Design a protein around this ligand. Sequence first.
Ligand SMILES: CCN(CC)C(=O)c1ccc(B(O)O)cc1
Lengths: 300, 237
Amino acid sequence: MNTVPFTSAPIEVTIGIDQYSFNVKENQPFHGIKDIPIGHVHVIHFQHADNSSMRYGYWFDCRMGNFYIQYDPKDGLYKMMEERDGAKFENIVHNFKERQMMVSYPKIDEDDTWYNLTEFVQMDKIRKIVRKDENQFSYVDSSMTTVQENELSDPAHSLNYTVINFKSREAIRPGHEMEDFLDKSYYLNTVMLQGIFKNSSNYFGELQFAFLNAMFFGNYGSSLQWHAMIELICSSATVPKHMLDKLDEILYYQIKTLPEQYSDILLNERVWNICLYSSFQKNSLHNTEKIMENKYPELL
Amino acid sequence: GAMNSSNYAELFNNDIKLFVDDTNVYRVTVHKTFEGNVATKAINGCIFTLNPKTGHLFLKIIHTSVWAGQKRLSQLAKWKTAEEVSALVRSLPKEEQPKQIIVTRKAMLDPLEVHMLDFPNIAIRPTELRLPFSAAMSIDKLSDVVMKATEPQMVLFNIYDDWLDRISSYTAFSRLTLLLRALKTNEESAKMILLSDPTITIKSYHLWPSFTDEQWITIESQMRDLILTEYGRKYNV
Ligand SMILES: CCN(CC)C(=O)c1ccc(B(O)O)cc1
């Protein structure tokens, strides 16, 4: 188990760690998070009590370095930093632990939620979507735009998701216009899977990362990307049987985790009704359809 | 965006454009089978492509053989329309390519947009106008060329004949739409009005008789009376 120590907590803030969250009061004796499960990416995120504008946070993998959080009073935010002095780091963490100044990552032994939400998400692929090569962790916030959104403004600060556009020359073969527009299998299987992503795991990793940024930061472009990647699969008549079964599981856990009170802003009614009831795969997502119909029947 | 009553004079500016109507592409007769089921028999159709400024009607004739062995023909017909419109644009030089194509039915937007991806600078637009172009098959020489076709073919008619010598294209389009609305509402009476007088005889090269300016005023009035008459008959007014 790994640790993300905090230098201090000078401003009141709601801190998230993966799907958990807790409140820290201004100048409260808080020195970070311990018992973080090894083997998964994680996200530590922030919403200031005095300014809920800008949710922001950091994707990281404790196997790739020793990371800590320090508030910057000039730029006004909690920043992730890497400590290269390993002995210093272990010594600091141990002190904070002995003084019990850290919250414990509160994982229930039965619970595979975080694994099921991040199964295909890898830090190496996050760092290609979020470009800041000098750090081993990746900053994301609520306002960052995607490359596609910028085609329709700073490029150093963009989310470089894979552009999906159903009315593009990439999506449509000259001479197969009706075929390719009504059946997206070419775009999915040849352009996206064989051509760009190479395998379905990388595709699912980007889909899962987009959902998590939509949920944790309210990042609108990430929500657009998540729905686009679902619709591309559901609108293809030819999808490998293992991809459909895995998608059903991926979506089930996403819908299960979504806050009920954010359902109105995070779920696109058109996309979900098309996918579950009209698309080629309308009958292939049994688990997802069941949780959607029992949890969010209004949307449908 | 969409085309309506406010920006209506845009139709007659110098930016080359076409109206595309697909309502006569896929045409069927419905009949009973010997077993008492219902089946369809396709008949030849056409794509109505009109330059409203010049009056040229580029009619593609859609021969029934294009439907042989195909499924979901009402959907295919929209994509076949878009395919043929794209092919006419592709055939033309850069200085004859239309800056806008206005579809009379919104269901043609995506098919045409997709076929025209190679032409990002050509705007594909719907219209709020209810245009009576479906009645183009009430014009005898157009209906004849379509029904006699044994193969795909695209035939030029001039739907304003020589009117442009005497009137503006705004006025010509208004006359055309009144004539087509009347033929749509009561085809027999409209043709009766148009042909009653055997002495102003619709010339061999013409669709519309060779009416004088004064006679067109009279014809146009009689067509309005027919439309008003049929409206009263329909709604018991
Ligand atoms: C789009 C089809 N075409 C080309 C046949 C037209 O609409 C067209 C263009 C220009 C003229 B003209 O002399 O100004 C007449 C007709």
